[PDB]
């Protein structure tokens, strides 16, 4: 088999293939994650360079791993499908053996492990994908939001963004998100998520996707009109 060591150290101690995988993420459309007091919201950018698209059948940016956990991403679209598939299989395997659905941390740790494995295995390149994994642990009402990246490191976030112009929306979130008092309701959390994307998106039409996840496997994706109402209310308050 093809055994070539593609991911290797350089004189300055860097693994360029892992770092170049991050550059693929930087190119990817922006994704954002914000957790409230009793919910988590995943915002995602849809570049409007592609019109005449069929939004019914086109792969959605946010994917359900189980009925209680979701995964969004920034980077190579084809690569993300492989991580999503493995994650979905592991979620059912966990339910089968442990007789309990995965925690959000466990599912994150698994995906991050897969990503890590591809950074020191022969004949493979790293995943050009960073993920945002969100949900609620079984029989638990505390919101969970984790991030992963090609290198394989993962961590928990009160709020986080990845992808193109993620520097800007992270700047926004760092000043607008208060830890002592997070978005108390679904409305407040979604609003702050849309606001953060509006710093980068361009038009607030079909370019913003929002998915709200609540405790006890209560996941729903907002429609165009529902999101458009948030876009309208934000800019009307801004004209002052």
């Amino acid at each position: 088999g093809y055994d070539r060591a593609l991911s290797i150290f350089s004189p300055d101690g860097h693994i360029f293939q892992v770092e170049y995988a991050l550059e693929a993420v930087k190119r990817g459309t922006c994704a954002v994650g914000v957790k409230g007091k009793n919910c988590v919201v995943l915002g995602c950018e849809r570049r409007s360079t592609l019109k005449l698209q069929d939004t019914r059948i086109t792969p959605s940016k946010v994917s359900k791993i189980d009925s209680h956990v979701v995964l969004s991403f920034s980077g190579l679209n084809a690569d993300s499908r492989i991580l999503i598939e493995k994650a979905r299989v592991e979620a059912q395997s966990h339910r089968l053996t442990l007789e309990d659905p995965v925690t959000v941390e466990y599912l994150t740790r698994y995906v991050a492990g897969v990503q890590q494995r591809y950074t020191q295995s022969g004949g493979v390149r790293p995943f050009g994908v960073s993920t945002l994994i969100a949900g609620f642990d079984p029989r638990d009402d505390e919101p969970k939001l984790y991030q992963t990246e090609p290198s394989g490191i993962y961590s928990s976030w009160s709020a986080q963004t990845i992808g193109r112009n993620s520097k800007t929306v992270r700047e926004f979130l760092e000043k607008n998100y208060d830890r002592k008092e997070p978005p108390a309701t679904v409305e407040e959390c979604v609003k702050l998520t849309v606001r953060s994307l509006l710093e980068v998106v361009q038009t607030g039409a079909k370019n913003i996707e929002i998915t709200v996840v609540k405790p006890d496997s209560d996941i729903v994706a907002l429609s165009s009109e529902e999101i458009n109402q948030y876009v309208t209310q934000i800019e009307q308050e801004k004209q002052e």
Binding site: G1, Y2, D3, R4
Partner: protein, 250 residues
């Protein structure tokens, strides 16, 4: 040891070119001219027997090969690559068809199997593409007579008539003027000999020309009698004498 070349030796260049395939086609261009013409009641395939030395017995070197009783093949380019492809083409006609359906494959599907082998040498680890273009002529019950070209890339096209190798550009132009949809087999053979004469420098006779046909069933070549449905092969390689007879009426 071990074949440690597990990676592709053919790759896309910045311009989108697959170098090794292009270079294989260049090797085909240098090869001796061969052609094929389809008639209403048959097909003819022909080529020059470029003898490397007069001491060599050019009868032992067969450029035109039987693949199945109703299918024949001819080439332009690297002879050794052709020889092994004929061996593989003959075997695959049995393993992936005859041993399953109890009958020989139709022309198009055998061509498809050959193409697949050539495509794989264009993508698999540690190998170069085949440096040949094949012209495969054949007949089968439901598709009738047919003529196919197969390139190093694995791409294949059906032809009414065509040429490959050294003087293909001039030969194809010659065939365009002469070909029509009302040709009989003898007429196609006559045109094949005319076309091939242009690309041949030296001697032009039955001993320097290799020519075969896909035509009527040959019960005399079957080797047995008693089964009415078995009527014999449609492939027949013309003899040195049979060629010379038609060169007088040329």
């Amino acid at each position: 040891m071990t074949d440690r070349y597990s990676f592709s030796l053919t790759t896309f260049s910045p311009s989108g070119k697959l170098g090794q395939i292009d270079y294989a086609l260049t090797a085909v261009k240098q090869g001796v001219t061969s052609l094929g013409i389809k008639a209403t009641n048959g097909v003819v395939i022909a080529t020059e027997k470029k003898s490397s030395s007069p001491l060599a017995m050019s009868e032992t070197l067969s450029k035109v090969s039987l693949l199945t009783p109703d299918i024949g093949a001819v080439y332009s380019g690297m002879g050794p690559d052709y020889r092994v492809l004929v061996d593989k083409s003959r075997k695959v006609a049995h393993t992936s068809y005859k041993r399953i359906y109890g009958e020989y494959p139709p022309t198009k599907l055998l061509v498809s199997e050959v193409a697949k082998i050539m495509q794989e040498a264009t993508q698999s680890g540690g190998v170069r593409p085949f440096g040949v273009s094949l012209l495969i002529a054949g007949h089968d019950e439901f598709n009738g007579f047919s003529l196919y070209q197969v390139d190093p890339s694995g791409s294949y096209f059906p032809w009414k008539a065509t040429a490959i190798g050294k003087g293909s550009v001039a030969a194809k132009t010659f065939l365009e003027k002469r070909w029509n949809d009302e040709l009989e087999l003898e007429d196609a053979i006559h045109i094949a000999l005319l076309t091939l004469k242009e690309s041949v420098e030296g001697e032009f006779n039955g001993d320097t020309i290799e020519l075969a046909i896909i035509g009527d069933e040959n019960p005399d070549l079957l080797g047995y009698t008693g089964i009415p449905t078995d009527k014999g092969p449609r492939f027949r390689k013309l003899t040195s004498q049979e060629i010379n007879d038609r060169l007088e009426a040329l």
